[PDB]
Amino acid sequence: MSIITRLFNNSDFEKLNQLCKLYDDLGYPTNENDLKKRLKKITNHDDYFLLLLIKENKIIGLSGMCKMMFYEKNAEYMRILAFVIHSEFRKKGYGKRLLADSEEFSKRLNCKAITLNSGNRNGYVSNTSGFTKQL
Amino acid sequence: MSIITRLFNNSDFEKLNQLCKLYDDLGYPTNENDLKKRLKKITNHDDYFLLLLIKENKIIGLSGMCKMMFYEKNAEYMRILAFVIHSEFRKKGYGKRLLADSEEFSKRLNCKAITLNSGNRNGYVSNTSGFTKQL
């Protein structure tokens, strides 16, 4: 109360304008039709977890995650794949809150670690560089 | 012929010493019992693809991958999670060959891109930094 985090649920297909607004802030604007299709696919996958930051019923942040297996040990970790706070809600600790809740959520799912990649243009260690090739 | 890449298959549970040797080169030595359990779990997941480099029946490299959905567009990409060439087979283009085959494999699965993180201690762009927190 009254800022909560909760997982995406099917009622959230009635809130696509709010989600579109966040994807725009993320730098990937879209439309409600395509977003509906995409989120339907993502949220029906057992390994993907879309965690939402809610303020007075409005979605004001999202943390899109996937739970992964290590190839090198028998354990699991979480990867944060998308993270955004609404452009009008910045510098008020919501980013900190949504990240902390993402970690807590991951820990409950027995993840040994949480990881993410961020662009170049709290206890997190940066010891890898990302390399991407378009195919 | 006679260097091939192929996916891991169940006959490869008879070659765990070869796989253990690669995990050691990877920096994560293990034993055959635990490795059997781990690879059983990983290879029974529809999204994970363990591609092997084979030379005269011997496993001399591995590329462990997972196929992922973008949160921000309706498409997929591949992540390379583990990549190693046998310590006695270095500087002979096997790394190049196994990477090229990983990309080709990914492209056939309709991946738009292939990505990986590498430590700090060919057409790939490096525009992200990795951040990891232990939980």
Side-chain angles (χ1 to χ4, degrees), chain A residues 1-120 122-135, chain B residues 1-120 122-135:
Chain A
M1 284 176 159
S2 76
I3 290 104
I4 73 155
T5 59
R6 57 164 178 83
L7 288 170
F8 180 95
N9 68 55
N10 282 352
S11 83
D12 290 321
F13 288 114
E14 286 288 341
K15 309 188 194 88
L16 293 155
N17 65 329
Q18 298 180 44
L19 293 156
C20 277
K21 159 63 186 155
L22 290 172
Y23 270 101
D24 187 17
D25 294 348
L26 197 50
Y28 293 89
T30 173
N31 61 76
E32 289 172 34
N33 274 355
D34 293 343
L35 192 49
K36 184 168 201 175
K37 286 186 181 67
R38 192 201 312 161
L39 295 179
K40 219 162 96 63
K41 202 189 55 147
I42 290 162
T43 66
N44 275 254
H45 196 293
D46 287 355
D47 294 326
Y48 288 69
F49 298 98
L50 178 52
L51 189 71
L52 303 180
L53 184 70
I54 314 291
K55 178 194 208 285
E56 278 151 300
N57 254 273
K58 176 185 182 166
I59 307 171
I60 57 144
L62 65 81
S63 182
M65 286 170 289
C66 182
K67 189 152 63 56
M68 319 270 312
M69 296 181 284
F70 290 98
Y71 266 89
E72 71 271 37
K73 61 189 102 161
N74 207 319
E76 303 191 356
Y77 63 99
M78 196 73 84
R79 177 166 280 272
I80 295 174
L81 295 167
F83 192 96
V84 62
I85 304 300
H86 192 291
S87 71
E88 297 184 274
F89 292 86
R90 306 275 176 78
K91 294 203 171 195
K92 292 172 154 46
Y94 294 115
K96 186 188 159 84
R97 163 67 183 284
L98 180 61
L99 186 62
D101 284 5
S102 296
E103 303 171 12
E104 198 185 341
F105 177 81
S106 302
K107 174 88 210 154
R108 179 176 189 167
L109 291 181
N110 279 257
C111 298
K112 271 186 35 150
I114 179 154
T115 194
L116 63 91
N117 280 7
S118 67
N120 298 332
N122 264 339
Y124 284 88
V125 183
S126 188
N127 274 111
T128 49
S129 294
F131 291 88
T132 306
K133 182 174 188 167
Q134 294 308 306
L135 295 175
Chain B
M1 284 176 159
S2 76
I3 290 104
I4 73 155
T5 59
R6 57 164 178 83
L7 288 170
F8 180 95
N9 68 55
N10 282 352
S11 83
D12 290 321
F13 288 114
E14 286 288 341
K15 309 188 194 88
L16 293 155
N17 65 329
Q18 298 180 44
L19 293 156
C20 277
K21 159 63 186 155
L22 290 172
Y23 270 101
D24 187 17
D25 294 348
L26 197 50
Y28 293 89
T30 173
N31 61 76
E32 289 172 34
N33 274 355
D34 293 343
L35 192 49
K36 184 168 201 175
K37 286 186 181 67
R38 192 201 312 161
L39 295 179
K40 219 162 96 63
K41 202 189 55 147
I42 290 162
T43 66
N44 275 254
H45 196 293
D46 287 355
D47 294 326
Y48 288 69
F49 298 98
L50 178 52
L51 189 71
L52 303 180
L53 184 70
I54 314 291
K55 178 194 208 285
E56 278 151 300
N57 254 273
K58 176 185 182 166
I59 307 171
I60 57 144
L62 65 81
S63 182
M65 286 170 289
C66 182
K67 189 152 63 56
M68 319 270 312
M69 296 181 284
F70 290 98
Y71 266 89
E72 71 271 37
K73 61 189 102 161
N74 207 319
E76 303 191 356
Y77 63 99
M78 196 73 84
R79 177 166 280 272
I80 295 174
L81 295 167
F83 192 96
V84 62
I85 304 300
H86 192 291
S87 71
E88 297 184 274
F89 292 86
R90 306 275 176 78
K91 294 203 171 195
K92 292 172 154 46
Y94 294 115
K96 186 188 159 84
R97 163 67 183 284
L98 180 61
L99 186 62
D101 284 5
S102 296
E103 303 171 12
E104 198 185 341
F105 177 81
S106 302
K107 174 88 210 154
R108 179 176 189 167
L109 291 181
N110 279 257
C111 298
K112 271 186 35 150
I114 179 154
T115 194
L116 63 91
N117 280 7
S118 67
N120 298 332
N122 264 339
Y124 284 88
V125 183
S126 188
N127 274 111
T128 49
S129 294
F131 291 88
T132 306
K133 182 174 188 167
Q134 294 308 306
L135 295 175

Short mmCIF file of all heavy atoms in Angstrom, two decimals, chain A residues 72-115:
data_model
loop_
_atom_site.label_atom_id
_atom_site.label_comp_id
_atom_site.label_asym_id
_atom_site.label_seq_id
_atom_site.Cartn_x
_atom_site.Cartn_y
_atom_site.Cartn_z
N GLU A 72 26.89 -24.06 -16.47
CA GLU A 72 28.10 -24.44 -15.74
C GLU A 72 27.90 -24.91 -14.29
O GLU A 72 28.84 -25.42 -13.67
CB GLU A 72 29.11 -23.29 -15.78
CG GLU A 72 28.73 -22.06 -14.92
CD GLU A 72 27.89 -21.01 -15.66
OE1 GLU A 72 27.02 -21.37 -16.48
OE2 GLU A 72 28.09 -19.81 -15.39
N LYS A 73 26.70 -24.73 -13.73
CA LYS A 73 26.37 -25.31 -12.43
C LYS A 73 24.91 -25.69 -12.40
O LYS A 73 24.12 -25.21 -13.21
CB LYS A 73 26.71 -24.35 -11.28
CG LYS A 73 25.98 -23.03 -11.33
CD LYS A 73 26.52 -22.05 -10.31
CE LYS A 73 27.43 -21.01 -10.98
NZ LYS A 73 27.63 -19.77 -10.16
N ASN A 74 24.52 -26.55 -11.47
CA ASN A 74 23.12 -26.92 -11.40
C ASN A 74 22.38 -25.92 -10.53
O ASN A 74 22.20 -26.13 -9.33
CB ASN A 74 22.93 -28.37 -10.91
CG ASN A 74 21.62 -29.00 -11.43
OD1 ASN A 74 20.57 -28.35 -11.47
ND2 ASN A 74 21.68 -30.28 -11.84
N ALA A 75 21.98 -24.81 -11.11
CA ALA A 75 21.27 -23.78 -10.37
C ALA A 75 20.56 -22.89 -11.36
O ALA A 75 20.66 -23.13 -12.57
CB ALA A 75 22.23 -22.96 -9.51
N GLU A 76 19.86 -21.87 -10.87
CA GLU A 76 19.15 -20.95 -11.74
C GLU A 76 19.43 -19.52 -11.33
O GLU A 76 19.87 -19.27 -10.22
CB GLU A 76 17.65 -21.21 -11.70
CG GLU A 76 17.32 -22.63 -12.09
CD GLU A 76 15.85 -22.86 -12.32
OE1 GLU A 76 15.05 -21.92 -12.11
OE2 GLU A 76 15.49 -24.00 -12.71
N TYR A 77 19.22 -18.60 -12.27
CA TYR A 77 19.33 -17.17 -12.00
C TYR A 77 18.25 -16.45 -12.80
O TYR A 77 17.62 -17.05 -13.68
CB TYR A 77 20.73 -16.66 -12.38
CG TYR A 77 21.06 -16.79 -13.85
CD1 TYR A 77 20.94 -15.70 -14.70
CD2 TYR A 77 21.52 -18.00 -14.38
CE1 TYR A 77 21.24 -15.79 -16.04
CE2 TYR A 77 21.84 -18.11 -15.74
CZ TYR A 77 21.69 -17.00 -16.56
OH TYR A 77 22.00 -17.07 -17.91
N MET A 78 18.04 -15.17 -12.48
CA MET A 78 17.10 -14.34 -13.22
C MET A 78 17.83 -13.32 -14.07
O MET A 78 18.84 -12.75 -13.65
CB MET A 78 16.17 -13.58 -12.26
CG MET A 78 14.93 -12.99 -12.92
SD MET A 78 13.64 -14.38 -13.37
CE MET A 78 12.66 -14.64 -11.71
N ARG A 79 17.31 -13.09 -15.28
CA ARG A 79 17.81 -12.01 -16.10
C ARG A 79 16.72 -10.95 -16.25
O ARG A 79 15.56 -11.27 -16.54
CB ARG A 79 18.29 -12.53 -17.47
CG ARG A 79 18.76 -11.43 -18.42
CD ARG A 79 19.54 -11.97 -19.63
NE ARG A 79 20.93 -12.30 -19.32
CZ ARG A 79 21.93 -11.43 -19.40
NH1 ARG A 79 21.68 -10.18 -19.77
NH2 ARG A 79 23.17 -11.80 -19.11
N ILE A 80 17.08 -9.70 -16.01
CA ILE A 80 16.17 -8.58 -16.26
C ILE A 80 16.40 -8.18 -17.72
O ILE A 80 17.52 -7.80 -18.11
CB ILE A 80 16.37 -7.39 -15.30
CG1 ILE A 80 16.04 -7.78 -13.87
CG2 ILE A 80 15.50 -6.18 -15.76
CD1 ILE A 80 16.36 -6.70 -12.83
N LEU A 81 15.33 -8.28 -18.52
CA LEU A 81 15.36 -8.06 -19.96
C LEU A 81 14.82 -6.70 -20.40
O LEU A 81 15.13 -6.23 -21.50
CB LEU A 81 14.62 -9.21 -20.65
CG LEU A 81 15.35 -10.56 -20.45
CD1 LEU A 81 14.49 -11.72 -20.85
CD2 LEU A 81 16.65 -10.59 -21.29
N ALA A 82 14.01 -6.08 -19.53
CA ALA A 82 13.36 -4.81 -19.82
C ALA A 82 13.01 -4.19 -18.49
O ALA A 82 12.42 -4.85 -17.63
CB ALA A 82 12.08 -5.03 -20.63
N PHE A 83 13.36 -2.91 -18.34
CA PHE A 83 13.13 -2.23 -17.06
C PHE A 83 12.87 -0.75 -17.33
O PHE A 83 13.70 -0.05 -17.91
CB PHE A 83 14.36 -2.40 -16.15
CG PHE A 83 14.13 -1.99 -14.72
CD1 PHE A 83 13.78 -2.94 -13.75
CD2 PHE A 83 14.28 -0.66 -14.33
CE1 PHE A 83 13.57 -2.57 -12.40
CE2 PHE A 83 14.07 -0.26 -12.99
CZ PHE A 83 13.71 -1.23 -12.01
N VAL A 84 11.72 -0.25 -16.91
CA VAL A 84 11.40 1.12 -17.20
C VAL A 84 10.43 1.66 -16.15
O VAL A 84 9.52 0.95 -15.72
CB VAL A 84 10.86 1.30 -18.65
CG1 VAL A 84 9.54 0.51 -18.87
CG2 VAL A 84 10.70 2.77 -19.00
N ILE A 85 10.67 2.90 -15.74
CA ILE A 85 9.73 3.68 -14.94
C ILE A 85 9.15 4.79 -15.82
O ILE A 85 9.89 5.48 -16.53
CB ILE A 85 10.41 4.33 -13.71
CG1 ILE A 85 11.10 3.29 -12.83
CG2 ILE A 85 9.39 5.16 -12.87
CD1 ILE A 85 10.15 2.18 -12.25
N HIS A 86 7.83 4.98 -15.74
CA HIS A 86 7.11 6.06 -16.40
C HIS A 86 7.86 7.40 -16.32
O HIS A 86 8.35 7.78 -15.26
CB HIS A 86 5.75 6.18 -15.73
CG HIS A 86 4.77 7.04 -16.47
ND1 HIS A 86 4.92 8.42 -16.58
CD2 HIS A 86 3.61 6.73 -17.09
CE1 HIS A 86 3.88 8.91 -17.25
NE2 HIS A 86 3.07 7.91 -17.56
N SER A 87 7.93 8.11 -17.45
CA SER A 87 8.79 9.32 -17.54
C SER A 87 8.40 10.41 -16.53
O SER A 87 9.25 11.21 -16.11
CB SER A 87 8.83 9.89 -18.97
OG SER A 87 7.60 10.49 -19.31
N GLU A 88 7.13 10.41 -16.12
CA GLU A 88 6.63 11.38 -15.12
C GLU A 88 6.82 10.93 -13.65
O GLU A 88 6.46 11.66 -12.71
CB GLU A 88 5.16 11.68 -15.38
CG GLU A 88 4.89 12.36 -16.74
CD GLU A 88 3.42 12.73 -16.94
OE1 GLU A 88 2.62 11.88 -17.40
OE2 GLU A 88 3.07 13.89 -16.63
N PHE A 89 7.41 9.76 -13.44
CA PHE A 89 7.58 9.24 -12.09
C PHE A 89 9.04 9.00 -11.71
O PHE A 89 9.34 8.12 -10.89
CB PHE A 89 6.70 8.00 -11.91
CG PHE A 89 5.23 8.30 -11.92
CD1 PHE A 89 4.53 8.37 -13.13
CD2 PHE A 89 4.54 8.56 -10.72
CE1 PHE A 89 3.17 8.68 -13.16
CE2 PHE A 89 3.18 8.87 -10.74
CZ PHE A 89 2.48 8.92 -11.97
N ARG A 90 9.95 9.77 -12.31
CA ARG A 90 11.39 9.53 -12.11
C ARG A 90 11.89 10.27 -10.88
O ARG A 90 11.24 11.19 -10.40
CB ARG A 90 12.21 9.94 -13.35
CG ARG A 90 11.78 9.32 -14.67
CD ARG A 90 12.40 7.95 -14.88
NE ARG A 90 11.90 7.33 -16.12
CZ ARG A 90 12.31 7.63 -17.36
NH1 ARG A 90 13.25 8.56 -17.56
NH2 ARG A 90 11.77 7.01 -18.41
N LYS A 91 13.06 9.85 -10.39
CA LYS A 91 13.75 10.51 -9.26
C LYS A 91 12.93 10.50 -7.95
O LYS A 91 13.01 11.41 -7.13
CB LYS A 91 14.21 11.93 -9.66
CG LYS A 91 15.29 11.92 -10.75
CD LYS A 91 16.14 13.20 -10.77
CE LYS A 91 17.34 13.04 -11.73
NZ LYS A 91 18.42 14.09 -11.55
N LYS A 92 12.14 9.45 -7.77
CA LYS A 92 11.29 9.33 -6.60
C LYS A 92 11.41 7.94 -5.96
O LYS A 92 10.56 7.57 -5.17
CB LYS A 92 9.85 9.61 -6.97
CG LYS A 92 9.62 11.06 -7.36
CD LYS A 92 8.23 11.25 -7.91
CE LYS A 92 7.76 12.69 -7.70
NZ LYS A 92 8.80 13.72 -8.06
N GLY A 93 12.44 7.18 -6.33
CA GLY A 93 12.74 5.91 -5.71
C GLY A 93 11.95 4.74 -6.27
O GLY A 93 12.09 3.63 -5.78
N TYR A 94 11.14 4.97 -7.30
CA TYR A 94 10.36 3.88 -7.85
C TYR A 94 11.25 2.87 -8.57
O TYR A 94 10.97 1.65 -8.59
CB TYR A 94 9.31 4.40 -8.80
CG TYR A 94 8.24 5.24 -8.13
CD1 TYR A 94 8.11 6.59 -8.43
CD2 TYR A 94 7.34 4.69 -7.22
CE1 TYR A 94 7.13 7.36 -7.84
CE2 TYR A 94 6.34 5.47 -6.60
CZ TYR A 94 6.25 6.80 -6.94
OH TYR A 94 5.28 7.62 -6.38
N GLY A 95 12.34 3.36 -9.17
CA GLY A 95 13.28 2.47 -9.86
C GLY A 95 13.93 1.54 -8.86
O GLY A 95 14.00 0.32 -9.08
N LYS A 96 14.40 2.13 -7.77
CA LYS A 96 14.98 1.40 -6.64
C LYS A 96 14.00 0.35 -6.05
O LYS A 96 14.36 -0.78 -5.79
CB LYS A 96 15.42 2.39 -5.56
CG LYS A 96 16.19 1.77 -4.39
CD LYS A 96 16.40 2.80 -3.28
CE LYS A 96 16.67 2.14 -1.92
NZ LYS A 96 18.10 1.75 -1.72
N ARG A 97 12.74 0.76 -5.88
CA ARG A 97 11.72 -0.10 -5.32
C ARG A 97 11.45 -1.28 -6.26
O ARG A 97 11.44 -2.41 -5.81
CB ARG A 97 10.43 0.71 -5.01
CG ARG A 97 9.16 -0.12 -4.81
CD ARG A 97 9.22 -1.00 -3.55
NE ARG A 97 8.03 -1.85 -3.38
CZ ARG A 97 6.84 -1.42 -2.97
NH1 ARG A 97 6.66 -0.14 -2.70
NH2 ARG A 97 5.83 -2.26 -2.87
N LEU A 98 11.26 -1.01 -7.56
CA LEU A 98 10.95 -2.07 -8.53
C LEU A 98 12.13 -3.06 -8.72
O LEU A 98 11.90 -4.25 -8.89
CB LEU A 98 10.48 -1.50 -9.87
CG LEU A 98 10.13 -2.49 -11.01
CD1 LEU A 98 8.98 -3.46 -10.66
CD2 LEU A 98 9.86 -1.76 -12.33
N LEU A 99 13.36 -2.56 -8.67
CA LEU A 99 14.54 -3.42 -8.71
C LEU A 99 14.62 -4.31 -7.46
O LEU A 99 14.77 -5.53 -7.56
CB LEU A 99 15.80 -2.57 -8.86
CG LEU A 99 17.13 -3.30 -9.05
CD1 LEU A 99 17.12 -4.14 -10.36
CD2 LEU A 99 18.28 -2.30 -9.03
N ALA A 100 14.50 -3.70 -6.28
CA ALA A 100 14.54 -4.47 -5.02
C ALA A 100 13.47 -5.57 -5.00
O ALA A 100 13.75 -6.67 -4.53
CB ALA A 100 14.37 -3.53 -3.81
N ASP A 101 12.27 -5.26 -5.51
CA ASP A 101 11.16 -6.23 -5.57
C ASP A 101 11.42 -7.31 -6.61
O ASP A 101 10.99 -8.43 -6.42
CB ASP A 101 9.83 -5.55 -5.90
CG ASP A 101 9.25 -4.81 -4.72
OD1 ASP A 101 9.90 -4.72 -3.65
OD2 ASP A 101 8.11 -4.33 -4.85
N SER A 102 12.11 -6.95 -7.69
CA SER A 102 12.54 -7.93 -8.71
C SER A 102 13.49 -8.95 -8.11
O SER A 102 13.35 -10.15 -8.37
CB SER A 102 13.18 -7.23 -9.93
OG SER A 102 12.21 -6.42 -10.58
N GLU A 103 14.46 -8.46 -7.34
CA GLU A 103 15.43 -9.34 -6.63
C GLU A 103 14.71 -10.23 -5.62
O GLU A 103 14.96 -11.43 -5.56
CB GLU A 103 16.50 -8.50 -5.91
CG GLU A 103 17.28 -7.55 -6.84
CD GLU A 103 18.19 -6.58 -6.11
OE1 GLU A 103 18.40 -6.78 -4.90
OE2 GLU A 103 18.71 -5.62 -6.73
N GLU A 104 13.80 -9.65 -4.84
CA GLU A 104 13.09 -10.40 -3.81
C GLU A 104 12.24 -11.52 -4.45
O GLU A 104 12.24 -12.66 -3.98
CB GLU A 104 12.23 -9.45 -2.94
CG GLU A 104 11.78 -10.03 -1.61
CD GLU A 104 10.85 -9.13 -0.82
OE1 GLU A 104 10.78 -7.90 -1.10
OE2 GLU A 104 10.15 -9.65 0.08
N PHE A 105 11.51 -11.16 -5.51
CA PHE A 105 10.77 -12.11 -6.33
C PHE A 105 11.70 -13.24 -6.82
O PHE A 105 11.37 -14.41 -6.70
CB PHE A 105 10.15 -11.36 -7.53
CG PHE A 105 9.40 -12.26 -8.50
CD1 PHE A 105 8.09 -12.68 -8.22
CD2 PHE A 105 10.00 -12.68 -9.69
CE1 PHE A 105 7.39 -13.51 -9.12
CE2 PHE A 105 9.31 -13.52 -10.60
CZ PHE A 105 8.01 -13.93 -10.32
N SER A 106 12.86 -12.87 -7.36
CA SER A 106 13.81 -13.86 -7.91
C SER A 106 14.33 -14.82 -6.83
O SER A 106 14.41 -16.06 -7.05
CB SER A 106 15.00 -13.17 -8.61
OG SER A 106 14.58 -12.33 -9.65
N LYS A 107 14.69 -14.25 -5.67
CA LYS A 107 15.17 -15.00 -4.52
C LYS A 107 14.12 -16.03 -4.09
O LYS A 107 14.46 -17.14 -3.74
CB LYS A 107 15.51 -14.03 -3.38
CG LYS A 107 15.90 -14.68 -2.05
CD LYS A 107 17.38 -14.95 -1.99
CE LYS A 107 17.72 -16.17 -1.12
NZ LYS A 107 19.02 -16.74 -1.58
N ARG A 108 12.85 -15.65 -4.10
CA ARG A 108 11.77 -16.58 -3.72
C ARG A 108 11.67 -17.74 -4.71
O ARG A 108 11.30 -18.86 -4.32
CB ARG A 108 10.41 -15.87 -3.61
CG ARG A 108 9.24 -16.80 -3.24
CD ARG A 108 7.93 -16.03 -3.05
NE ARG A 108 6.83 -16.82 -2.50
CZ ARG A 108 5.70 -16.29 -2.02
NH1 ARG A 108 5.53 -14.98 -2.05
NH2 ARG A 108 4.75 -17.05 -1.53
N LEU A 109 12.00 -17.46 -5.97
CA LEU A 109 12.06 -18.52 -7.00
C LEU A 109 13.37 -19.28 -7.02
O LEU A 109 13.67 -20.00 -7.98
CB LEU A 109 11.81 -17.93 -8.37
CG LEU A 109 10.39 -17.45 -8.58
CD1 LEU A 109 10.24 -16.91 -9.97
CD2 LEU A 109 9.43 -18.59 -8.35
N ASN A 110 14.18 -19.10 -5.98
CA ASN A 110 15.41 -19.88 -5.80
C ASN A 110 16.52 -19.48 -6.75
O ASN A 110 17.45 -20.25 -6.98
CB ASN A 110 15.15 -21.38 -5.98
CG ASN A 110 14.57 -22.02 -4.75
OD1 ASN A 110 15.29 -22.70 -4.01
ND2 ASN A 110 13.27 -21.83 -4.52
N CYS A 111 16.44 -18.29 -7.31
CA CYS A 111 17.55 -17.79 -8.11
C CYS A 111 18.74 -17.43 -7.24
O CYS A 111 18.61 -16.80 -6.19
CB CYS A 111 17.11 -16.61 -8.98
SG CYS A 111 15.81 -17.09 -10.15
N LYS A 112 19.91 -17.83 -7.69
CA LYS A 112 21.15 -17.62 -6.98
C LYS A 112 21.71 -16.24 -7.27
O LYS A 112 22.64 -15.78 -6.60
CB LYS A 112 22.18 -18.66 -7.44
CG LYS A 112 22.16 -19.95 -6.66
CD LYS A 112 23.31 -20.89 -7.07
CE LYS A 112 24.63 -20.17 -7.45
NZ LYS A 112 25.86 -21.01 -7.14
N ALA A 113 21.17 -15.60 -8.29
CA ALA A 113 21.72 -14.34 -8.76
C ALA A 113 20.74 -13.70 -9.72
O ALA A 113 19.85 -14.36 -10.25
CB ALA A 113 23.05 -14.57 -9.45
N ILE A 114 20.88 -12.40 -9.92
CA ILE A 114 20.06 -11.70 -10.88
C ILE A 114 21.02 -10.92 -11.75
O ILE A 114 22.03 -10.40 -11.24
CB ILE A 114 19.00 -10.81 -10.15
CG1 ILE A 114 18.13 -10.05 -11.15
CG2 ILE A 114 19.66 -9.88 -9.13
CD1 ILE A 114 16.75 -9.70 -10.58
N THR A 115 20.76 -10.88 -13.05
CA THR A 115 21.67 -10.19 -13.97
C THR A 115 20.91 -9.35 -15.00
O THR A 115 19.69 -9.50 -15.17
CB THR A 115 22.70 -11.16 -14.62
OG1 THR A 115 23.77 -10.42 -15.24
CG2 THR A 115 22.05 -12.07 -15.65
#
